[PDB]
Amino acid sequence: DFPRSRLRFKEKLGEGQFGEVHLCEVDSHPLLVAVKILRPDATKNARNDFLKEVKIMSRLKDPNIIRLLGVCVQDDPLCMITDYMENGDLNQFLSAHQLEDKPTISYPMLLHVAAQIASGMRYLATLNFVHRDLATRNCLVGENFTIKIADFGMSRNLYAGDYYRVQGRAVLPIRWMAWECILMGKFTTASDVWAFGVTLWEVLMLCRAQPFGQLTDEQVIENAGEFFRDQGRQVYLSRPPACPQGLYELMLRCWSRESEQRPPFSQLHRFLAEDALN
Ligand SMILES: Cc1ccc(CNC(=O)Nc2cccc(F)c2)cc1NC(=O)c1cnc2ccccn12
């Protein structure tokens, strides 16, 4: 439940939220899994966190969401078992690739990467599961360009500049957050839509520039205030080179001031799986 002695620890994949991730083998030999083990200096608070993350992840059962295939909690040290995504982090995976002239990635593949995120996000919406932190950095690539949405938290020093940090406040992925999250702390499905819009811009940017990169933290926060004000002073992410106008129009709708005028993930999937092909 699941037998801990069946796990064979092979490499360190990265750090992790409450300890390290290991690539493991299961003889059931190279049936590969990822194993997150609770750090050995891990405080009572991190253990609680780890156990909650276990419960949250047990809910998530979709091809395009990370799967908890197993757990080793019933004895110390605490362990979490997921699929292994061989290409790792989607932001770092895309960062290497260049758009196909006329590692490469083509435009229809960028659509397929996006549609897999639209599908997994559609799944979460049916659970009324609010992600709160959709971005390429929380996505994993397992090939054949198979995308799993995950959540690595907000503490890793690689993506430090992606979060806005105030002493004693919640850590805020502001460049991905809908105006109403920024001003009110209101995370919904509709704000997940907004972040998908930004994630979709990231994919189409091949993860080569930060959303509102040339703007400061403050400026992103006051841009949210420009959305509330509704005076036509709100500034949007520009069209990525790899992005047509038809598709960019869909990114824009994602950032509609009115949450209910943002497209449901069902429509974002229909667009990226069907309409973006024509
Ligand atoms: C083993 C493990 C445990 C916990 C996590 C991160 N928890 C989540 O994603 N929770 C979560 C919460 C809410 C919504 C949601 F959608 C998700 C991830 C992993 N697995 C890896 O880290 C891994 C797998 N393949 C590779 C390849 C390279 C590097 C890392 N990995």
Tell me, yes or no, whether 70 and 140 share the same domain: no
CATH of the domain at 208: 1.10.510.10
Cα distances from 180 to residues 56, 103, 192, 225, 255, in angstroms, run 25, 38, 12, 9, 11
153 Cα: distance to centroid of ligand 1 (angstroms): 10
3-state SS of 77-146 is CCEEEEECCCCEEHHHHHHHCEECCCCEECHHHHHHHHHHHHHHHHHHHHCCCCCCCCCHHHEEECCCCC
Any ligand 1 atom below 6 A from CB of 137: no
Closest protein CA for atom 21 of ligand 1 = 34
Calpha distance 34→80 (Å, rounded): 8
Tally of domains in the chain:
2
Question: Do the Cβ atoms of 19 and 37 come closer than 8 Å?
Answer: yes
**101 shares a domain with 68:** no
Residue owning the nearest CA to atom 24 of ligand 1 = 84
Same domain, 95 and 203: yes
Task: Name the burial class of residue 79, with classes exposed (0-12), middle (13-18) and buried (19+) by CB atoms within 10 angstroms of its CB.
Answer: buried
Q: Which atom of ligand 1 is nearest to the CA of 148?
A: 16
Q: DSSP state, 275?
A: I
44 & 129 share domain: no
End residue of a domain, out of 69, 84, 99: 84
Please tell me whether residues 66 and 106 are part of one structural domain: no
Q: Is the CB of 140 under 6 A from ligand 1?
A: yes
Pair of tokens at residue 102: 């006329």
The Cα 171–Cα 151 span in angstroms is 14
**Tally of CA atoms within 13 A in the half-sphere of 62 that contains its CB:** 22
Instruction: Give CA–CA dist 218/204, Å, rounded.
Output: 25
**Is the shortest distance between the CB of 24 and ligand 1 below 6 Å?**
no
Residue 81 β-bridge partners = 35, 70
Looking at the fold, whether 71 and 122 belong to one and the same domain comes out as no
Does 33 contact ligand 1 (Cβ within 6 A)? no
Tokens, residue 235: 């500034």
Q: Which of 89, 133, 151, 192 is catalytic?
A: 133
Answer yes or no: do 47 and 160 share one domain.
no
Could you tell me the distance, in angstroms and rounded to a whole number, from the CA of residue 71 to the centre of ligand 1? 13
Question: Is the domain of 70 the same as that of 136?
Answer: no
d(CA 29, CA 26): 6
Rounded CA separation 198/39 (Å): 33
Q: What is the CA radius of gyration of the chain?
A: 19
Q: How far is the CA of 219 from the centre of ligand 1 (A)?
A: 32
- Kindly tell me the burial class for residue 274, based on how many C-beta atoms sit within 10 Å of its own C-beta (0-12, 13-18, 19 or more): exposed
Q: Strand locations in the chain, DSSP E?
A: 7-14, 21-26, 31-37, 68-72, 79-83, 88-89, 98-99, 104-105, 139-141, 147-149
Q: From atom 28 of ligand 1, which residue's Cα is the shortest distance away?
A: 88
54 Cα to the center of ligand 1, angstroms:
11
Question: What is the rounded (10 degree) CA torsion for 247, 249, 253, 257?
Answer: 140
Annotated catalytic residue 133? yes
Residue of 107, 134, 110, 272 whose CA lies nearest to 193: 134
> Which phi and psi angles does 245 have, rounded to 5°?
-65, -40
Burial 179-209 (b: 16+ CB within 10 A, else e): bbbbeeeebbbbbbbbbbbbbbbbbbbbbee
Contact 115, 186 (CB under 8 A): no
Whether residues 37 and 159 share a domain: the answer is no
Same domain, 63 and 200: no
For residue 85, which of 147, 170, 16 has the smallest C-alpha distance? 147
Clarify whether residues 62 and 93 are in a common domain: no
Residue ending a domain, among 18, 51, 84, is 84
Could you tell me if the CB of 174 is within 6 A of ligand 1? no
Question: Rounded to whole angstroms, how far apart are CA atoms 249 and 186?
Answer: 25
Which CATH number do you get for residue 24?
3.30.200.20
> Which of 21, 32, 87, 126 has most ligand 1 atoms within 8 Å of its beta carbon, as the pocket-test mutant?
21
Domain finish residue from 49, 84, 119: 84
> Is the domain of 30 the same as that of 99?
no
> The domain containing residue 46 runs over which residues?
1-84
List, comma-separated, the residues after which the chain is broken, a break being a C to N distance over 2.5 A; otherwise answer none: 28, 102
Q: Is 159 strand, coil or helix?
A: helix
